Symmetry: D3
């Protein structure tokens, strides 16, 4: 799990949450097939609601210009972000995301390599509502400050606990990475961090260009696009 | 070889075949390059003939909504269906399909993972014309009722026997699957039928969600798009 | 990080630890290459020590008959277990395990797909000594009850904190799995657990034999031996 | 499904069957696991039976000298052949073969890439006893002349129908190929046959040496050993 | 390195060079990210300069209809060709190309499997300016006649030596191949040349269709699109 | 083509060549199979020759302790070195090496990932005898000083030109690498050189241990053993 903070500033988050608080919400089951629909009991904006289209586009521009998201996710496709609200006991029980998610009836299709939640509500403003991620050998609970993003592989079973007080607004989306295998992405991420550290401490060292070549030749071997 | 019956109803097949019988046909060697053109001796509609465009689109809408085709083929791209007529001795001797088929000057290009024939003529309405498929260790002959589709891997050498009486009308196309390797697709197909059977017999069993998670993680590992 | 408890019984662990307390120890910088030897400040038994070979053989027999270890590790090769002691400030600073470890006497070489530590000391009897495993975006600290084993991928930088009070006795080793990729092993492990759960609940269901066939076909696709 | 005829001569087959007719048989439920032993209702020779070891060695010598078996199977390991008898209603209901079979003595483990049955009984001499191999979209039944072998991928559920009259004697085994994937083995097999055909027809052609290099380069890319 | 001569005729090269000589040149550092920009000291046309768009399109059509380029490169994407000029000491020190190059801010993104330079200056018309390609085990210097193309893998470190007299005009671009691995591309290229040679010497041989089938099944196995 | 000089000292080379000059030689066609034997017109020592086994063991001990050979070849298996003599017009026309070579004593089989020739004769002492290696787009000729080794991928057609004056003595062998793919091996080799250069210039840099971890994780991903 990668926590990427402050995608939006505090004033931006306040503006976005105010619009979400005043939006006309629809039943969340519309974007789930008949299976995980049994587990989904929240509210969602329609995909092409103008607020969802506007903030989704704003999220994409921020993420494509975030060095941490670019390095760790190596994004190729970002599914148009969806917006949900858990309140009044709303929840999303344990489910796996579909391997391929269609956009506008299959115009674009996104392999769900990575999943993400961007929190638009303060953790003090709702009870429950934790994003619970279950791996093979353990569980992780995530409840981040408003404006922060969590990034985790699409291979995990996850759920959102019921919200028992207040309301939780967030955006969620999937990313198809250039690099499908998470162990390969993390290897590239760690190697890039090492190269960045060496560039600061000892720039102009001839081994840096060759290690950069190694990094990009790995990307050549592994990138699908 | 997968036989998918009744893509169209009997009344629809009668309408489609009547239009095909009244269409203006061209020499089939147009679509074949100067290698398999020596083996191709049939009639074909031009690719953008309005009948070929109309029934091709109707064909895609039915196939995209057919659970058997969706599960077995896992389609990503469907080449715009071509339409042919074997009559008066027309035939297509043994040939292999090109690995990549270009659409409209290469705007889209389809890797020919799977081949398909949709029969529009009754088997009783023509002699010969069998679709003969030769794998490494044997041969299969296919002559299906009108409205039925045959699906088979693009890796095989195949031919159409001469038509010595009547006329054989059919559509043919290739599919680029999300999953390139046939053994991977069949594993996924078999797994899905097992999960479908368990959902019927014992729904809400907690292992069903996890096996569905397994299926989609395999699709996540194997899907190219 | 998989926790496999009670490899040995509490009585057995006491006998093993008592023997290790009376053993003659060697400087740990004899079995790590000169580089990781800079980070190594602990005690180790020589690989030809009879006590190390005796306990190591007992560990192998237990592990090769342990369903949890067999399923999660899918072992092909197990490097002969080594035994270390951390006491009086002894530690092992951060290091990466060599990808291929040669076994004394030639012949065998083990790809270090999985790492493991079997704890022989009670956690309350020593201070510090935690096994710290560095992830891409996380730290994990491990200090398990005596007789328990931790299994983790060999792809991680790890270390052992200094033991300030008491002594920490343990065995460590590496495993070459049939399945190299950790994401594949966990997928197989999860699938097997789901099948056992279904086998208990609804036996003789025809989907069990087919899903078992799916499991072994995946093992057939992925196993290297 | 590849049929390899006349591994042994007719005279040899009569001697082998006569010896097997006079041998002391054991219950077949001693070689397969619990799940498969439920489906197993036949007779088998113990793996240390001298007749099984003598005939099995004779099978290995013939198979390793057989150009057809060598090319289509590309064998790396052959599991020591086993011998069974189906008579008096004996059968082996549907089952899948374990992906990895351990050889007595502990040292060797065979990935079951390919399955094989060598028939020692005349098909006219017994009723039933068909080897039924279940495909994704088909069923294949095999009942071959005495002395003939069938070679087929280990990825299929298969069974043997009850023998209602007479007795069916056969040998079965598994092969770990150099080339794990069946589509790769068939590609190599077809390519080698084409080269041999060209070698007979137009020898000394400079493209023969280069295509042979292509064949071995593919074997270099795909062979695991 | 593949040398493909006479992409353009002598008269066409003269016309193109005259326009390049009269064009308004900009600093090259624009296309170089902040890294290789320290190594880039030449002149480039803006990407959408009408001369760059016109000749890039003209190169595009010539290459798509060139049998040597189609077979060796197996192109899927061609980055819109860039145009540079080295003069007055201009050079490009050692650098590695980025694995993924974006077109117009990411509408299309090209994996840089292959790199290419098309020379528009006569070697006699400038001093220095050699394209130097450093492999693991050696260096190659390329300085080709005007109108000729060089094709080489994108995995190499390369540079252009300073031009100390005259001026060097050229176009450069990258190609994403259908087949990512260079060893797979060369195997296909060599095998295609063998099949072409056999078709000339002995056409209508039944092994040619099967080897062509082998070639296309390899392309089916390896092509990404 | 990697050139590894001075496997033996000049004094050692003189003793080795002096022994080979006095040894009893055999027809080279006994080793190579037909087709390759058609192109083989040289002398070779039998594999049970004591001089071949003595020098061969000396080569193995030197190579296994040579950092350059260890890094570039990443050897898993080395085929017992063979010894040949070219003189009086003796030659070896173009040929590919078999992908899998069996070692005489049974048991071991070597995938011929890499080829090598150790020169025991001074290049001035014989005319001709060049080792010609044919690439996809070029030819390389090798005639190295006595005691030097050439290492090159096993994927190439190669030959030895006739020796018209003098005699050429050499040892040749194949290596199965831990890493099958040549592009992977060179990537690892280049990465290791970059790490070693950095280790000398800026030791104790925290990026060195992490980059070493990256190297071994790549080795963990790619090594087959």
């Amino acid at each position: 799990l990668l926590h990427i903070p402050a995608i939006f500033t505090a004033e931006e988050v306040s503006r976005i949450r105010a619009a979400l608080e005043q939006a006309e919400w629809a039943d969340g089951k519309a974007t789930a097939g008949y299976q995980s629909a049994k587990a989904k009991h929240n509210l969602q904006l329609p995909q092409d609601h103008p607020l969802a289209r506007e903030i989704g586009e704003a999220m994409l521009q921020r993420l494509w210009n975030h060095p941490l998201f670019m390095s760790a996710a190596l994004p190729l496709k970002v599914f148009p972000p969806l917006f949900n609200c858990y309140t009044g006991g709303g929840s999303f029980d344990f489910h796996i995301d579909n391997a391929v998610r269609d956009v506008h009836g299959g115009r674009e299709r996104v392999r769900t390599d990575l999943s993400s939640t961007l929190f638009f509500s303060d953790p003090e403003d709702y009870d429950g509502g934790e994003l619970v991620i279950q791996d093979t050998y353990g569980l992780q609970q995530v409840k981040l400050p408003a404006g922060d993003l969590v990034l985790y592989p699409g291979t995990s079973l996850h759920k959102v606990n019921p919200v028992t007080r207040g309301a939780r607004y967030a955006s969620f989306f999937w990313t198809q990475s250039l690099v499908r295998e998470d162990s390969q992405r993390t290897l590239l991420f760690e190697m890039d961090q090492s190269i960045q550290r060496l560039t600061r401490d000892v720039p102009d060292h001839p081994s840096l260009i060759r290690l950069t070549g190694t990094y990009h030749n790995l990307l050549r071997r592994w990138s699908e696009l």
